[PDB]
């Protein structure tokens, strides 16, 4: 049979109708039991009356069994209107880019309008995964009366209560009234050094962050994590955003618009194919929007249950019951020292992979207090002193009485680069280091040494922990380090906490 | 100077009285500075017809706010949804007159939607007040799987959070299900005897019939329900003694229209004294920009309190819904409905009438009944709990200890 | 199984098994067995 | 046993970013304050807040 699919794009995109047709052009057996006749259209701008007229005209003339809408602007008012049109005309609509991609909370049960975006639940899940990955167990929660905040807080509490990580949720803050006038400041004053999950609109988030800076809440050890609701247009970066503001969003860099259109067409084609296999044939669309047809208008067979389990090009683009992607292409970006949104991590198949194994310290502002309490520490694995173990399979975090420590393990014998795996270090030296941290009140970023082994002066160049310390790549060595004359000449040693001579061991 | 106010009403006399109310408000405030011109249109069976009509007539008229109401036909399947979307495109505030559906309470979907009647979910608050009056702690919830049931359950749970208490169970059923016997069977074994229901009329009637068939409406049980459970078909199968809620002016149009026009006129007068006020966009097609002061207008409306409203003191909470509405507690007696009290903004005050609880008894029944059939779970531990297979007679052979005393077996 | 808070593979939700699951799910109202009292079990239920 | 947890000098103004992170460091139950009466009012108001 023939399946008519309409693809709508805005004028801002520098994409032509010819290549929209070519996107379903090479004929590589994309559609096995049916032939897709893609019809494309571009509108200069999206305003309501033109939107209804265009959709109705394409339904009448082209007799489209589906729709793929791609908006250019960031107007959030287009999503609900598309949902309403889908509910009225029973046309499966797919939000692709711009306003059409803004996730809606609740949709009409009779509507078949799906979106390519991540719900607030998935953003909360990914931010919590970030927090777990960097051992930011202690955290606070500052929100406003912005819509959906109750759902966000409820989901955060539910995820905290049902996690083995052992989260430390200090408090829930709701600045419902004026920010700099009323008692709100008092609440903002009871937040200590932790991670602040901030959820509010950008216009008021600027005020909140400015007030936090005025209250000294933007230090080196304060990490602000915010969802995509505030981190909207990347090009618009207010000066009040502190550097290192961790955020999550839908990626517009890698996952380009052409790939979006191809994915949408593939999803529609696969759903139509599965529906053809299950039901009898593809049903004709509605006659016209107008006329007030005397009919229940409910199709005998629809595309709802067929869109739940869809696989295209090996990617799992399935959709949930509400319309959220099961595997959204979520990206984690930060505000670096150059005041530009820089990609850091990605979220694929319920797994979060980060470029930085250990969180680098970001200068929040030009007047920020310089970081001196954070120390980089080298360490070498020794059987009784420094035991290196893998992450706990049960809680997926470093267990009690151990500390995080990143090991730079090579990929394989061929390549020369490697990856930093965050393992858990424990033992005598680790306990001494923990006690020193609790006494002197200094933080540390433990990391194992891979260059040398206990230090050795070769070609007048030191390796190992001694090499790392002398070349200022780290502050101290905590491993099983023997105090020797040359080492004491090169680096300064503390008092010996355990006597280790040279001894001979033999079989009895 | 001229400010246009738009309206989508049901019957011609409704628009006529809306116009005369606008004229009265203009005379009250004074038309010397600003003249309030009222434009209006009737409903249409097709939602897309509303979508085109609001653009062609309402948006093209440079309106500041649109007052929407339900059609005369008893159908209530999200009729004001299209307008709230279209006027939501430009952040034009929309005043809901008689729309009690709670999906509009979510400002995430509808960016600018005000209303003068509390939604069905707010009814839960009244039930919470009953907890403080009759001392009921253990209850069963019978919400539906649609948005109304979820919202009502969430609001009730949030209110019970401050009491450090939770409902015994929250039973959920799909809308329009013929068989609901399983849920009532599961609820029967629970010790709590207070049933709270909130669903559609057909589902309420089905649950009432199932409860009557399962001997669920006898003595010792109390039913608290919303307005939808005591109106229409749900009334014909409603068991005696149930307690429902009714809004005083829920079905009234005149009072709501007058109060909404008054409050929107007051908000317009308060807004127009501000600086750099931007007129609303003209024409639905070719004008994609949002109203610059639209959010400011909505904030002004939500912060505006009417002095002497016909329905009462009109006040809007942070969710854009009416606050402190008079609820009439309605009790079913001998297949007839009688008022047994009234709920003001905060508290409930009864009347000289005597409340007849289900089962015919006049004494206030206890919230829950003690269960003396304790379901015991035990594990097989040899020194503590020997387990032995029984014979064909149903019991295992009796033994005796060293002292000769028989060993007790269960 | 006596009862132990175990992470179910799907949805990553804490769930109690054995007697703990039977009691918390409402299928039983009292546990009479060699049940050792400790911090983890006393958080969700009450011991005599 | 005397526990000199910290000795804080509130050199700058009493409302800016500094003297807020400094006042948060006091986890002890006894605070010996020394200033003028007008500055004492501001410091105690900030501590109450």
Curated annotation (Swiss-Prot), chain C:
| Annotated positions binding glycine | 34, 36, 41
Q: Which domain of life is it from?
A: Eukaryota
Modification after translation, per record: NMDA is probably regulated by C-terminal phosphorylation of an isoform of NR1 by PKC. Its phosphorylated state is influenced by the formation of the NMDAR-PPP2CB complex and the NMDAR channel activity.
As for subcellular location, the record says: Cell membrane; Postsynaptic cell membrane; Synaptic cell membrane; Postsynaptic density membrane
UniProt tissue specificity:
Detected throughout the brain, in brain cortex, cerebellum, thalamus and olfactory bulb.
Q: Which residues are glycosylated?
A: 9
Which family does the record assign?
Answer: Belongs to the glutamate-gated ion channel (TC 1.A.10.1) family. NR1/GRIN1 subfamily.
Q: How are the domains described in the entry?
A: A hydrophobic region that gives rise to the prediction of a transmembrane span does not cross the membrane, but is part of a discontinuously helical region that dips into the membrane and is probably part of the pore and of the selectivity filter.
Q: What biological function has been recorded for the protein in this entry?
A: Component of N-methyl-D-aspartate (NMDA) receptors (NMDARs) that function as heterotetrameric, ligand-gated cation channels with high calcium permeability and voltage-dependent block by Mg(2+). NMDARs participate in synaptic plasticity for learning and memory formation by contributing to the long-term potentiation (LTP). Channel activation requires binding of the neurotransmitter L-glutamate to the GluN2 subunit, glycine or D-serine binding to the GluN1 subunit, plus membrane depolarization to eliminate channel inhibition by Mg(2+).
Note the subunit structure: Heterotetramer; the NMDAR subunits are modular and harbor tiered domains that function in concert to regulate opening and closing of the cation-selective ion channel pore. Forms heterotetrameric channels composed of two GluN1/zeta subunits (GRIN1), and two identical GluN2/epsilon subunits (GRIN2A, GRIN2B, GRIN2C or GRIN2D) or GluN3 subunits (GRIN3A or GRIN3B) (in vitro). Can also form heterotetrameric channels that contain at least two GluN1 subunits and at least two different GluN2 subunits (or a combination of one GluN2 and one GluN3 subunits) (in vitro).
From the Swiss-Prot or TrEMBL record, give the protein name: Glutamate receptor ionotropic, NMDA 1
Tell me the organism's taxonomic lineage. Answer: Eukaryota, Metazoa, Chordata, Craniata, Vertebrata
Relative to the complete UniProt sequence, the shown stretch is: 483 to 530 of 938
Swiss-Prot record, chain D:
Q: Where in the cell is it found?
A: Cell projection, Dendritic spine; Cell membrane; Synapse; Postsynaptic cell membrane
Tissue distribution is: Detected in brain cortex, olfactory bulb, hippocampus including the dentate gyrus, striatum, thalamus, superior colliculus, inferior colliculus, midbrain and cerebellum (at protein level). Detected in brain cortex, hypothalamus and cerebellum.
The family line of this record is:
Belongs to the glutamate-gated ion channel (TC 1.A.10.1) family. NR2A/GRIN2A subfamily.
| Subunit and partners | Heterotetramer. Forms heterotetrameric channels composed of two GluN1/zeta subunits (GRIN1), and two identical GluN2/epsilon subunits (GRIN2A, GRIN2B, GRIN2C or GRIN2D) or GluN3 subunits (GRIN3A or GRIN3B) (in vitro). Can also form heterotetrameric channels that contain at least two GluN1 subunits and at least two different GluN2 subunits (or a combination of one GluN2 and one GluN3 subunits) (in vitro). In vivo, the subunit composition may depend on the expression levels of the different subunits. Found in a complex with GRIN1, GRIN3A and PPP2CB. Found in a complex with GRIN1 and GRIN3B.
Q: What does this protein do?
A: Component of N-methyl-D-aspartate (NMDA) receptors (NMDARs) that function as heterotetrameric, ligand-gated cation channels with high calcium permeability and voltage-dependent block by Mg(2+). NMDARs participate in synaptic plasticity for learning and memory formation by contributing to the slow phase of excitatory postsynaptic current, long-term synaptic potentiation, and learning.
UniProt note: domains: Contains an N-terminal domain, a ligand-binding domain and a transmembrane domain. Agonist binding to the extracellular ligand-binding domains triggers channel gating. A hydrophobic region that gives rise to the prediction of a transmembrane span does not cross the membrane, but is part of a discontinuously helical region that dips into the membrane and is probably part of the pore and of the selectivity filter.
| Designated name of the protein | Glutamate receptor ionotropic, NMDA 2A
The organism is Rattus norvegicus (Rat)
Q: What is the taxonomic lineage of the source species?
A: Eukaryota, Metazoa, Chordata, Craniata, Vertebrata
What gene does the UniProt entry assign to this protein?
Grin2a
């Amino acid at each position: 049979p023939a399946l008519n699919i309409a693809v709508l794009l805005g004028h801002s995109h520098d994409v032509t109708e010819r290549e929209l047709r070519n996107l379903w052009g090479p004929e590589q057996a994309t559609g096995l039991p049916l032939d897709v006749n893609v019809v494309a259209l571009l509108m200069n701008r999206t305003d309501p009356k033109s939107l209804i007229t265009h959709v109705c005209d394409l339904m009448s003339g082209a007799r489209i069994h589906g729709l793929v809408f791609g908006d250019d602007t960031d107007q959030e008012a287009v999503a609900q209107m598309l949902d309403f049109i889908s509910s009225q005309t029973f046309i499966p609509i797919l939000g692709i880019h711009g306003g059409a991609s803004m996730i809606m909370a609740d949709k009409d049960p009779t509507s078949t309008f799906f979106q390519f975006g991540a719900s607030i639940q998935q953003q909360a899940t990914v931010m919590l995964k970030i927090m777990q990955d960097y051992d930011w167990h202690v955290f606070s929660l500052v929100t406003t009366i912005f819509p959906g905040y109750r759902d966000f807080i409820s989901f955060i509490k539910t995820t905290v209560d049902n996690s083995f990580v052992g989260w430390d949720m200090q408090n829930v803050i709701t600045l419902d009234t004026s920010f700099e006038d009323a008692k709100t400041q008092v609440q903002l004053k009871k937040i200590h050094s932790s991670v602040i999950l901030l959820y509010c609109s950008k216009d008021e988030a600027v005020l909140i962050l400015s007030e936090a800076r005025s209250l000294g809440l933007t230090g080196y050890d304060f990490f602000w994590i915010v969802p995509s609701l505030v981190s909207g247009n990347t090009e618009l970066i207010p000066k009040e955003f502190p550097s290192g503001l961790i955020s999550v969003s839908y990626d517009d860099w890698d996952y380009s618009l052409e790939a979006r259109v191809r994915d949408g067409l593939g999803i529609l084609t696969t759903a139509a194919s599965s529906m053809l296999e299950k039901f009898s044939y593809i049903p004709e669309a509605k006659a016209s929007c107008y006329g007030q047809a005397e009919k229940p208008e409910t199709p005998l067979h629809t595309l709802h249950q067929f869109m739940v389990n869809v696989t295209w090009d090996g990617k799992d683009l399935s959709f949930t019951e509400e319309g959220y992607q099961v595997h959204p292409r979520l990206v984690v970006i930060v505000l670096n020292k150059d005041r530009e949104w820089e990609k850091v991590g990605k979220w694929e198949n319920q797994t979060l992979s980060l470029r930085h194994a250990v969180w680098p310290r970001y200068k929040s502002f030009s007047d920020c207090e310089p970081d001196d309490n954070h120390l980089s520490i080298v360490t070498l694995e020794e059987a009784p002193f420094v035991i290196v173990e893998d992450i706990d399979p049960l809680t997926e975090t470093c267990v009690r009485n151990t500390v995080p420590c990143r090991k730079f393990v090579k990929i394989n014998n061929s390549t020369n680069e490697g990856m930093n795996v965050k393992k858990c270090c424990k033992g005598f030296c680790i306990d001494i280091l923990k006690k020193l941290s609790r006494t002197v009140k200094f933080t540390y970023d433990l990391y194992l040494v891979t260059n040398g082994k206990h230090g050795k002066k070769v070609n007048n160049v030191w390796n190992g922990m001694i090499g790392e310390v002398v070349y200022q790549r780290a502050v101290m060595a905590v491993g099983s380090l023997t105090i020797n004359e040359e080492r004491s000449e090169v680096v300064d040693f503390s008092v010996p906490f355990v006597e280790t001579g040279i001894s001979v061991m033999v079989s009895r | 100077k001229i400010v246009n106010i738009g309206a989508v009403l049901s019957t011609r006399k409704h628009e006529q009285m809306f116009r005369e109310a606008v004229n009265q408000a203009n005379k009250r405030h004074g038309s010397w500075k600003i003249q309030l011109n009222a434009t209006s249109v009737t409903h249409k069976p097709n939602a897309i017809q509303m979508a085109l009509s609001v653009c062609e007539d309402l948006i093209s008229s440079q309106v500041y706010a649109i007052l929407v109401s339900h059609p005369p036909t008893p159908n209530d399947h999200f009729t004001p949804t299209p307008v709230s979307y279209t006027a939501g495109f430009y952040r034009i505030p929309v005043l809901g007159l008689t729309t009690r559906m709670s999906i509009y309470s979510d400002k995430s979907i509808h960016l600018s939607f005000l209303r003068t009647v509390p939604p069905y979910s707010h009814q839960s608050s009244v039930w919470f007040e009953m907890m403080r009056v009759y001392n009921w702690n253990h209850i069963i919830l019978l919400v539906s799987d649609d948005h109304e049931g979820r919202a009502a359950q969430k609001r009730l749970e949030t209110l019970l959070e401050e009491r450090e208490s939770k409902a015994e169970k929250v039973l959920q059923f799909d809308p329009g299900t013929k068989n609901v016997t399983a849920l009532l069977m599961e609820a029967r074994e629970l010790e709590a005897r207070v049933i709270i229901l909130s669903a559609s009329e057909d589902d309420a009637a089905t649950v009432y019939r199932a409860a009557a068939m399962l001997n669920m409406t006898g003595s010792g049980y109390v039913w608290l329900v919303g307005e939808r459970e005591i109106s229409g078909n749900a009334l014909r199968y409603a068991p005696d003694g149930i307690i429902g809620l009714q809004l005083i002016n829920g079905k009234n149009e005149s009072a709501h229209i007058s109060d909404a026009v008054g409050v929107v006129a007051q908000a317009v007068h308060e807004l127009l004294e501000k600086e750099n006020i931007t007129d609303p966009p003209r024409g639905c097609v070719g004008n994609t920009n949002i109203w610059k002061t639209g959010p400011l207008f909505k904030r002004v409306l939500m912060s505006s309190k009417y002095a002497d409203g016909v329905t009462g003191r009109v006040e809007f909470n942070e969710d854009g819904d009416r606050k402190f509405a008079n609820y009439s507690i309605m009790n079913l007696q001998n297949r007839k409905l009688v008022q047994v009290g009234i709920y003001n903004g905060t508290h409930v005050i009864p009347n000289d009438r005597k409340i007849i609880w289900p089962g015919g008894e006049t004494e206030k029944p206890r919230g829950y009944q003690m269960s003396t059939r304790l379901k015991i779970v035990t594990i097989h531990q040899e020194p503590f709990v020997y387990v032995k297979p029984t014979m064909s007679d149903g019991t295992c052979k009796e033994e005796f200890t060293v002292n000769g005393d028989p060993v007790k077996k269960v | 199984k006596f009862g132990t808070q175990e992470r179910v593979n799907n949805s990553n939700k804490k769930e109690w098994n054995g007697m703990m699951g039977e009691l918390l799910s409402g299928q039983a109202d009292m546990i009479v067995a060699p049940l050792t009292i400790n911090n983890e079990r006393a958080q969700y239920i009450e011991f005599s």
